Design a protein around this ligand. Structure first.
Ligand SMILES: NC(=O)c1ccc[n+]([C@@H]2O[C@H](COP(=O)([O-])OP(=O)(O)OC[C@H]3O[C@@H](n4cnc5c(N)ncnc54)[C@H](O)[C@@H]3O)[C@@H](O)[C@H]2O)c1
Ligand SMILES: NC(=O)c1ccc[n+]([C@@H]2O[C@H](COP(=O)([O-])OP(=O)(O)OC[C@H]3O[C@@H](n4cnc5c(N)ncnc54)[C@H](O)[C@@H]3O)[C@@H](O)[C@H]2O)c1
Lengths: 427, 427
């Protein structure tokens, strides 16, 4: 068995939910219809490290339908949906992922995607968070020469690529999929606007209405989280280090505050910073009894979980834990500080993951075909492809585009078929 | 009298409202405090073409306090606040602006800023919409050699600059002030979110709640307009030519439709496209009795007002008119299709105009000092100045910034004092 999953017999349940998700993912299904005959990824050998969800299974099978061979692992120890991994494993696709991995099992799973039977080695990386990129660069540099490039899913992974490039550590071309508009401004924002609530509500019977909720970070994710909780009747506080993002939050009616000031006043804390130890031991000590603490940023290091090692952890149910302080006060921590929407729920819904993953497929096609035209730097896909991604998703939600006349295209200086905005337009 | 205004005796009223606006405009007052002693604009001779409002008077006096000599005109025939122009005129600053100019008077006013007593000629342009830039390039090309550059306020003006550059018509450096983040994402969005309602409510006793309102265009302005009307209980429809902006509107719960389809179904139509003849005669013929039609984009050419020339126009009150169709049906048109928030009300509130105009002052300083380092192209101010603008406005609305620790700055790859985002971050 060239796979490792929890229970293979969950495959039929996974297939059923995959069939449903396909009908919510028109971008991926359109790429199959456009490309599955020509097979533009025949000869592609993709090592993938990205949350093994039902939506990711549709990504995997789209890559396969386009001719790729892949080997897959998840980029988080709690984010796998076992029945999704099983459905993929049942198709014969090598996948190494289950919900609740140890850290040792996590890195073993990543390692399994770098080599397969018969001397299989990847010529492409598909990464979400930079761990697979890290492993190849730091531990298998012999693989780097045959890797055409990496396409990277998330903000934290791109930050790691930027730092590698700055220091001359990046040795392959990189496509920043996060900063496709149809990713960052949809997945990160609208996806989290729904899936933060999913994780919070599955984990606890805590009411949102009337609570004081603090969001750390007001980037694309924090913007969605703030919208989510405000709609449900919470008083929403925001912390920011960036004065432009702080001003945006203030102009939406949020008080912009520091956790140092407000730790005693909050019922719910959501870290969305992409940063390190924004919630410290003293904050958690100061938090009220039964306060809820979770992280929706990529790595659990947003919270200094290590400071809680000596307290009793009393498990409530899977991925919901009480940490009991010596004075008897308790806090509720979700998923041990790992990504809450994927640890305590099922991640983003299918429709918005389709926009992200259509971008992923196009990046893989571009790297596989034209990696020779790229240097060892970070790039984004051109705006014409970004607009194509949006176009492919309009029909599902019944949106009808107006067509420019010739004089209207000339008036604003665009082609009738786009692209419709200057390169640095921010939407 | 080196000025032309409506009634100079309104100056004391203008001074009173200017004093109030100063307390809402901390960015401009901070630049006075930082720079009024060193006078970085001593020797600057600015021709300005920008809505002569109370907020613009604070801009003008900030430039003057920094050492500039200016001559001012408005960029719209209805947008001047007569008492603001009078307060400026009373200070001895040459200004040529009144509410309700004819088109001949409008262009005469622009012409007055290009020459003053004693052979005064500008060495800097400050433009909002591109009309002043057009006049200098097309009718006074002798002035171009001594003009250090132009800073441009709005989306439509930047579009005109881009087209000039593409064809080799741009003969001075240009600073795109619109695409400072602290302008486009604040002024265009939050400003219009308030000032569309201002104009609509001052013009008519029309209730928003229960109405079907159509916004043409879902860029920064249309986004604010949609938010405004939705908060007040209207069913909000959106039209778009750009599939990314259409998808954004759909993901906020707006039906994305064409005016060709829905003309008979709408109570209110707001053009926010920056484009040409998006509302045609047939649309207006099809609109219901007492339907309200207005434009919040820069030029009245969004609506083919010319098609209504032969119908009776029955004035309701200043800038509110009935157009009576031969079948007896009437539509209400605001400000003859000119900018509704400035024609039927007073434009954006002071706080957000401060962020825009602080950017304007910094662009003028940069052009005056360093125009030699620029070619005849369009540029934006660097992100460090954009962040400074936001920083200067945080105190007024009580927002408290978190400070990065050293390890946190290193973790995300930024300096503790910024800039905090990559150059192409979209906020
Ligand atoms: N859970 C999900 O489904 C999901 C989806 C996309 C991204 N992410 C992850 O979420 C994180 C945020 O993503 P994003 O796209 O919003 O990034 P972003 O850079 O757009 O937003 C992060 C924000 O955090 C702020 N910040 C940084 N340090 C801070 C501190 N100490 N205190 C307060 N604010 C601070 C920054 O100023 C910035 O505005 C990343 O780790 C990203 O990989 C998660
Ligand atoms: N009233 C104000 O206070 C104010 C403030 C800022 C800008 N403006 C003006 O408003 C206009 C829009 O500014 P913006 O910053 O939102 O620009 P933008 O480019 O961000 O938004 C314009 C949008 O209109 C869409 N569009 C173009 N042609 C269309 C058509 N035929 N049908 C439907 N949609 C169409 C474009 O796709 C785009 O998304 C410009 O003229 C700008 O100068 C007015």
């Amino acid at each position: 068995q060239d796979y490792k999953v929890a229970e293979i017999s969950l495959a039929d349940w996974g297939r059923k939910e995959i069939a449903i998700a396909e009908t919510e993912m028109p971008g991926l299904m359109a790429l199959r219809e456009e490309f599955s005959a020509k097979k533009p990824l025949q000869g592609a050998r993709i090592a993938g490290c990205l949350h093994m969800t039902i939506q990711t299974a549709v990504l995997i099978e789209t890559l396969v339908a386009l001719g790729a061979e892949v080997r897959w692992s998840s980029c988080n120890i709690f984010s796998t949906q076992d029945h999704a991994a099983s459905a993929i494993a049942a198709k014969g696709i090598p996948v190494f992922a289950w919900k609740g991995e140890t850290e040792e099992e996590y890195w073993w799973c990543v390692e399994q995607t770098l080599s397969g039977p018969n001397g299989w080695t990847p010529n492409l990386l598909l990464d979400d968070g930079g761990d697979l990129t890290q492993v190849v660069h730091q531990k298998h540099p012999k693989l780097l020469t045959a890797i055409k490039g990496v396409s990277e899913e998330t903000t934290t992974g791109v930050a790691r690529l930027y730092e590698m490039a700055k220091h001359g550590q990046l040795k392959i071309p990189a496509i920043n999929v996060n900063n496709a508009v149809t990713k960052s401004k949809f997945d990160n924002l609208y996806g989290c606007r729904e899936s933060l609530l999913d994780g919070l509500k599955r984990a606890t019977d805590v009411m949102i209405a009337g609570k004081v909720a603090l969001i750390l970070g007001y980037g694309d994710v924090g913007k969605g989280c703030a919208q989510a909780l405000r709609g449900q009747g919470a008083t929403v506080l925001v912390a920011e280090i960036d004065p432009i993002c702080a001003l945006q939050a203030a102009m939406e009616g949020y008080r912009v505050v520091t956790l140092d000031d407000v730790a005693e006043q909050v019922d719910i804390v959501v870290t969305a910073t992409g940063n390190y130890h924004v919630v410290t031991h003293d904050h958690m000590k100061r938090m009220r009894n039964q306060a809820i603490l979770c992280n929706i940023g990529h790595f659990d290091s947003e919270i200094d979980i290590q400071s809680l090692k000596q307290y009793q952890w009393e498990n409530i149910k899977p991925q919901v834990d009480h940490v009991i302080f010596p004075d008897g006060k308790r806090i509720i921590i979700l998923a041990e500080g790992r990504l809450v929407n994927l640890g305590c729920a099922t991640g983003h819904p299918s429709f918005v993951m389709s926009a992200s993953f259509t971008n992923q497929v196009l990046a893989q096609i571009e790297l596989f075909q034209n990696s020779s035209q790229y240097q060892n730097q970070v790039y984004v896909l051109p705006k014409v492809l970004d607009e194509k991604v949006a176009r492919l998703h309009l029909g599902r939600i019944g949106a009808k585009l107006t067509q420019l006349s010739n004089e209207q295209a000339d008036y604003i200086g665009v082609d009738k078929n786009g692209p419709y905005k200057p390169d640095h337009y921010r939407y």
